[PDB]
Design a protein around this ligand. Structure first.
Ligand code: HEM
Ligand SMILES: N#Cc1ccc(O[C@H]2CC[C@@H](NS(=O)(=O)C(F)(F)F)CC2)cc1Cl
Length: 453
């Protein structure tokens, strides 16, 4: 019945995602672009190289759109990230369109992101050009964009309610992306801190949902909760609906989480690379002058006029390889793939590293170089190998939102400040710190000096 691809014999100090990714690439030279690993008896089919990822995720997108299963009695399978089947499908679709300004009133997403870019620059001023770990401030901006989308609220960076939300978020994140040693490093007294925090986040959202239910109005939705509340309205006498209070709560939490950390970390990584490559930062600052000036705030229509800057933002995401193995997929049914027969349910692991760091598409793929996204005349050159957000039907739902944040926030920063390293660029170490899921940048500090020539 099942014929899985070949692989090494089963079962196989502190091991991070980048070490895992490197092992995966070494195994592909032995067995080729598609291979199986077993862990005891649980098999995992690995897809390595662009032709394998495309054929599977894109040309057989439906079959490969499942999500890999611990299970958590936390019971978090009711949103988007952890859901499967019919439920995932409708919730994902609904979320996509709401995130593209459908059903959410007349204020745009861009507007939200631009408002936050202004506050982000205000807070950056308050560090007074003195040495700063940007971790916290860069966390708060994406978190507020999402708060605003889901609840219609943004917060001061000192507000204790906003602080608590982020703390609980960071905690669950740290727990879940712990390194391996075989098995996941974690177990101490941690499974319970997870579940508690989860319960606290879901209650905080449910409290907001109760308020929204009071003033609810088919003609005036203004955020995700209203839009979701009003879809439940139209889905009565269509029992049993996928749209419930339970799944609204789970979906909003998925979006908080997924939306705050990935962008935070990418921004922090982008500042590190800009400190290390000052000639790149200068051409970015030149381009911003020439197209935007220091007068008005950046907008998305500027990007088309700013090829160099566009290549830099692209090259940060390609270089850093934020999620080397994406998140685990699974096949939705039994499927013929090349010469293999993969049973319904089998875990699929996708090597995004093998794509982003392809040595023919991106010669010297280990180096940071904006010309990876420029043609020989200096125009913007897009690439089918740009898959930081994955590909196919499970492509990141906040793809468009994340592109906006990275561009608007990075250009606002660079429009108003120069960046100064305390360590000499020459020596500044930029190797990622070990993490079980993601490429995380090392600690660094810098000063934001308000702008002068
Ligand atoms: C630099 C920013 C970001 C990167 C690099 C990134 C990358 C990814 C990747 C690789 C996945 C997994 C896709 C797969 O399974 O193959 C994912 C999923 C997801 N992203 Fe993002 N993401 C980012 C920002 C965001 C933002 C801002 C949101 C806000 C809405 C978001 C919401 C999600 C959700 C909900 C999923 C789960 C999708 C599903 O299972 O269908 N992401 N992202
Ligand atoms: N990139 C990315 C990315 C990062 C984290 C992530 O999971 C988040 C983990 C934290 C929140 N989930 S939760 O309920 O605390 C948990 F993890 F299930 F316990 C919200 C989802 C999901 C994604 Cl897509």
């Amino acid at each position: 019945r099942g014929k899985l691809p070949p692989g090494p014999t089963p079962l196989p100090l502190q091991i991070g995602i980048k070490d895992i990714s490197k092992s995966l690439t070494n195994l592909s030279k032995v067995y080729g672009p598609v291979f199986t690993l077993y862990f005891g008896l649980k098999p995992i089919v690995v897809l390595h190289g662009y032709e394998a990822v495309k054929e599977a995720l894109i040309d057989l997108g439906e079959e490969f759109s499942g999500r890999g299963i611990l299970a958590e009695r936390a019971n978090r399978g009711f949103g988007i990230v952890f859901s499967n089947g019919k439920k995932w499908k409708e919730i994902r679709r609904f979320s996509l369109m709401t995130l593209r300004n459908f059903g959410m009133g007349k204020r745009s997403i861009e507007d939200r992101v631009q408002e936050e870019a202004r506050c982000l620059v205000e807070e950056l001023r308050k560090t007074k050009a003195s040495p700063c770990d940007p971790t916290f401030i860069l966390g708060c901006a994406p978190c507020n964009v999402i708060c605003s989308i889901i609840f219609h609220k943004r917060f001061d960076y000192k507000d204790q309610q906003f602080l608590n939300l982020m703390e609980k978020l960071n905690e669950n994140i740290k727990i879940l992306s712990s390194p391996w040693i075989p098995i996941i490093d974690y177990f101490p007294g941690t499974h319970n801190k997870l579940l508690k925090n989860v319960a606290f986040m879901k209650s905080y959202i449910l409290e907001k949902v109760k308020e929204h239910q009071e003033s609810m109005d088919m003609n005036n939705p203004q955020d995700f909760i209203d839009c979701f509340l009003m879809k439940m309205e139209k889905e009565k006498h269509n029992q049993p609906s996928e749209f419930t209070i339970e799944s609204l709560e789970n979906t909003a939490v998925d979006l908080f989480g997924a939306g705050t950390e990935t962008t935070s970390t990418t921004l922090r990584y982008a500042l590190l690379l800009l400190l290390k490559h000052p000639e790149v930062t200068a051409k970015v600052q030149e381009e911003i002058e020439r197209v935007i000036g220091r007068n008005r705030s950046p907008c998305m229509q500027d990007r088309s006029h700013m090829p160099y800057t566009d290549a830099v933002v692209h090259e940060v995401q390609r270089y850093i390889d934020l999620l080397p193995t994406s998140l685990p997929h699974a096949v939705t049914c039994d499927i013929k793939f090349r010469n293999y027969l993969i049973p319904k349910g089998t875990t699929i692991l996708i090597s995004l590293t093998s794509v982003l760091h392809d040595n023919k598409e991106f010669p010297n793929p280990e180096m940071f170089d904006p010309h990876h996204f420029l043609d020989e005349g200096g125009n913007f050159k897009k690439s089918k190998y740009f898959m930081p957000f994955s590909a196919g039907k499970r492509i990141c739902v906040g793809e468009a939102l994340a592109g906006m944040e990275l561009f608007l926030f990075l250009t606002s920063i660079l429009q108003n400040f120069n960046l100064k390293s305390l360590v000499d660029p020459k020596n500044l170490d930029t190797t990622p710190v070990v993490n079980g899921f993601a490429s995380v940048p090392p600690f660094y500090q810098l000063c934001f000096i308000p702008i002068h020539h």
